[PDB]
Design a protein around this motif. Structure first.
Motif, PDB file in Angstrom:
ATOM      1  N   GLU A  96      93.429  55.356  18.243  1.00 31.08           N
ATOM      2  CA  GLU A  96      94.469  54.574  17.823  1.00 31.08           C
ATOM      3  C   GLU A  96      94.403  54.080  16.354  1.00 31.08           C
ATOM      4  O   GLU A  96      93.328  53.378  16.198  1.00 31.08           O
ATOM      5  CB  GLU A  96      94.998  53.441  18.638  1.00 31.08           C
ATOM      6  N   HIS A  97      95.341  54.414  15.522  1.00 32.07           N
ATOM      7  CA  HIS A  97      95.108  53.884  14.149  1.00 32.07           C
ATOM      8  C   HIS A  97      95.393  52.531  13.757  1.00 32.07           C
ATOM      9  O   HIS A  97      96.582  51.934  14.182  1.00 32.07           O
ATOM     10  CB  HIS A  97      96.131  54.693  13.049  1.00 32.07           C
ATOM     11  N   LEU A  98      94.442  51.592  13.718  1.00 29.42           N
ATOM     12  CA  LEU A  98      94.464  50.036  13.589  1.00 29.42           C
ATOM     13  C   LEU A  98      93.837  49.488  12.246  1.00 29.42           C
ATOM     14  O   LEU A  98      92.709  48.877  12.336  1.00 29.42           O
ATOM     15  CB  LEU A  98      94.103  49.344  14.829  1.00 29.42           C
ATOM     16  N   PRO A  99      94.292  50.102  11.179  1.00 29.75           N
ATOM     17  CA  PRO A  99      93.608  49.217   9.867  1.00 29.75           C
ATOM     18  C   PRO A  99      94.079  47.854   9.777  1.00 29.75           C
ATOM     19  O   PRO A  99      95.129  47.464  10.232  1.00 29.75           O
ATOM     20  CB  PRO A  99      94.193  50.169   8.771  1.00 29.75           C
ATOM     21  N   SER A 100      93.644  47.221   8.772  1.00 31.27           N
ATOM     22  CA  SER A 100      94.132  45.736   8.433  1.00 31.27           C
ATOM     23  C   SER A 100      95.413  45.890   7.837  1.00 31.27           C
ATOM     24  O   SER A 100      96.038  46.993   7.306  1.00 31.27           O
ATOM     25  CB  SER A 100      93.176  45.279   7.306  1.00 31.27           C
ATOM     26  N   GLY A 101      96.296  44.817   8.051  1.00 32.40           N
ATOM     27  CA  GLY A 101      97.758  44.818   7.431  1.00 32.40           C
ATOM     28  C   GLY A 101      97.484  44.046   5.871  1.00 32.40           C
ATOM     29  O   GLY A 101      96.296  43.745   5.840  1.00 32.40           O
ATOM     30  N   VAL A 102      98.634  43.855   5.426  1.00 35.71           N
ATOM     31  CA  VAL A 102      98.674  42.966   4.259  1.00 35.71           C
ATOM     32  C   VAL A 102      99.677  41.958   4.343  1.00 35.71           C
ATOM     33  O   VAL A 102     100.708  42.332   5.016  1.00 35.71           O
ATOM     34  CB  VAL A 102      98.836  44.042   2.887  1.00 35.71           C
ATOM     35  N   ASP A 103      99.341  40.600   3.987  1.00 40.72           N
ATOM     36  CA  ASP A 103     100.272  39.607   3.904  1.00 40.72           C
ATOM     37  C   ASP A 103     101.433  39.647   2.763  1.00 40.72           C
ATOM     38  O   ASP A 103     101.399  39.318   1.763  1.00 40.72           O
ATOM     39  CB  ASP A 103      99.722  38.143   3.760  1.00 40.72           C
ATOM     40  N   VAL A 104     102.690  40.190   3.207  1.00 39.59           N
ATOM     41  CA  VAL A 104     103.676  40.573   2.283  1.00 39.59           C
ATOM     42  C   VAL A 104     104.453  39.219   1.779  1.00 39.59           C
ATOM     43  O   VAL A 104     105.294  39.664   0.971  1.00 39.59           O
ATOM     44  CB  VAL A 104     104.670  41.402   3.011  1.00 39.59           C
ATOM     45  N   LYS A 105     104.028  38.099   2.457  1.00 41.97           N
ATOM     46  CA  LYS A 105     104.549  36.782   1.786  1.00 41.97           C
ATOM     47  C   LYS A 105     103.611  36.247   0.582  1.00 41.97           C
ATOM     48  O   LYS A 105     104.080  35.432  -0.151  1.00 41.97           O
ATOM     49  CB  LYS A 105     104.825  35.900   2.873  1.00 41.97           C
ATOM     50  N   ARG A 106     102.446  36.353   0.949  1.00 42.12           N
ATOM     51  CA  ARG A 106     101.299  36.019  -0.178  1.00 42.12           C
ATOM     52  C   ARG A 106     101.422  37.055  -1.186  1.00 42.12           C
ATOM     53  O   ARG A 106     101.226  36.852  -2.458  1.00 42.12           O
ATOM     54  CB  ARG A 106     100.005  35.832   0.560  1.00 42.12           C
TER      55      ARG A 106
END
Length: 378
Positions: free
Chosen positions: A163-173
């Motif tokens: 399963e592809h589970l990379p880090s996300g990015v904080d789109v509010k910061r």
């Protein structure tokens, strides 16, 4: 709701890649459905950090959590006491070698997350055998990029689901700058609204291609004499980078390691983000994914990415360009072309922001984790 025990040697307050990965993924889940079993580096600091959380952390009173009978026993008793459904090894090698014990203790699903290191593990006979043992006992193996998956898939074997589970990015910061903030940031840097600005945020090591960027500058400067390359970050390669930049000193700025918000403000105010990552170290020094590319897109900034590893997977033809760093003529050509086309830049950056909101946010990635942890075992 299925309950998850996270088993890890890599947890805050200690600073690091996997620490940030787990902290941010756990925060996307229902805190009542999460328990952490983590090593302890400093007792008072760990207690102080855990006190801030809305989920339970059970601290293992050892500086390093290792796969040993005593550790496995402690894990087993938590599984039964907290009625644990899922056991998630935050890093696969070597702790997921306790996956057998997890199933013995009554867990119905075992998950292990890979990152960068497992690629190197697939290169040696012994470490490869360890990867297979993990694979045979793990139900779900997560990976950060299609690149890393290709490198180690055969080592793990066909037992787990991948399963592809990379880090996300904080789109509010990480968010596009208002005209006011962008204008002020540039003035803070001693620039104006008209200054061509290329930003490179990354550790100062050869593979990140700051050297490639510096070598491309003479042509960029000739076309756009006020163009500024901002090198943001720190590392051992700094002295070499400064030497490389000697004849382009007026157009290259070594800003050092900036404070978090200052780095974001600088990023969001740039015209282009560029980091032409190259694979080195005999194929082992590689860009696993490249969160900096996602951060740039989240700030609505056009991206130039490198060919290394999973780097090209971060961008689309609408949001960014992929180039070989060592191709000086093409890199400089791409930079001048983009700097000379503010409409294309606006369109690319808009597309970058839309891309991460659709595919890379912590909301999106959190949902991916929820699906893994909450689905009935196969």
């Amino acid at each position: 709701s299925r309950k998850t025990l996270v088993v890890t040697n890599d947890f805050p307050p200690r600073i690091g890649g996997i620490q940030s990965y787990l902290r941010d993924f756990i925060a996307t889940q229902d805190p009542e459905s999460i328990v952490v079993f983590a090593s302890t580096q400093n007792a008072e600091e760990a207690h102080a950090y855990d006190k801030t959380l809305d989920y339970e952390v059970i601290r293992w009173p050892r500086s390093v959590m290792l796969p040993t009978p005593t550790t496995a026993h402690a894990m087993a008793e938590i599984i039964r006491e907290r009625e644990i459904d899922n056991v998630w090894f935050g890093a696969a090698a070597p702790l997921a070698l306790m996956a057998g014990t997890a199933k013995q203790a009554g867990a119905s699903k075992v998950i292990a997350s890979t990152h960068g290191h497992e690629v190197g593990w697939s290169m040696l006979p012994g470490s490869r055998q360890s990867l297979r043992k993990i694979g045979t006992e793990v139900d779900v193996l997560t990976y950060i990029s299609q690149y890393t998956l290709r490198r180690f898939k055969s080592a793990f074997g066909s037992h787990p689901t991948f399963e592809h589970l990379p880090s996300g990015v904080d789109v509010k910061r990480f968010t596009p700058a208002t005209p006011e903030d962008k204008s002020a940031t540039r003035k803070k840097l001693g620039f104006t609204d008209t200054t061509p600005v290329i930003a490179c945020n990354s550790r100062l090591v050869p593979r990140k291609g700051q050297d490639s960027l510096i070598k491309a500058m003479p042509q960029v400067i000739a076309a756009r004499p006020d163009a500024q390359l901002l090198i943001v970050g720190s590392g051992r390669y700094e002295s070499t980078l400064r030497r490389l930049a000697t004849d382009v000193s007026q157009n290259v700025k070594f800003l050092g390691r900036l404070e978090y918000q200052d780095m974001i403000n600088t990023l969001a105010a740039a015209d282009i983000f560029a980091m032409p990552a190259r694979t080195r170290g005999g194929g082992l020094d590689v860009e696993g994914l490249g969160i900096v590319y996602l951060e740039a897109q989240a700030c609505g900034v056009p991206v130039i990415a490198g060919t290394s590893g999973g780097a090209p997977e971060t961008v689309t033809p609408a949001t960014g360009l992929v180039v070989e760093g060592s191709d000086v003529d093409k890199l400089s050509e791409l930079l001048i072309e983009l700097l000379d086309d503010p409409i294309r830049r606006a369109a690319m950056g808009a597309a970058g922001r839309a891309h991460v909101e659709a595919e890379w946010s912590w909301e999106i990635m959190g949902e991916r984790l929820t699906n893994i942890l909450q689905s009935e075992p196969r």
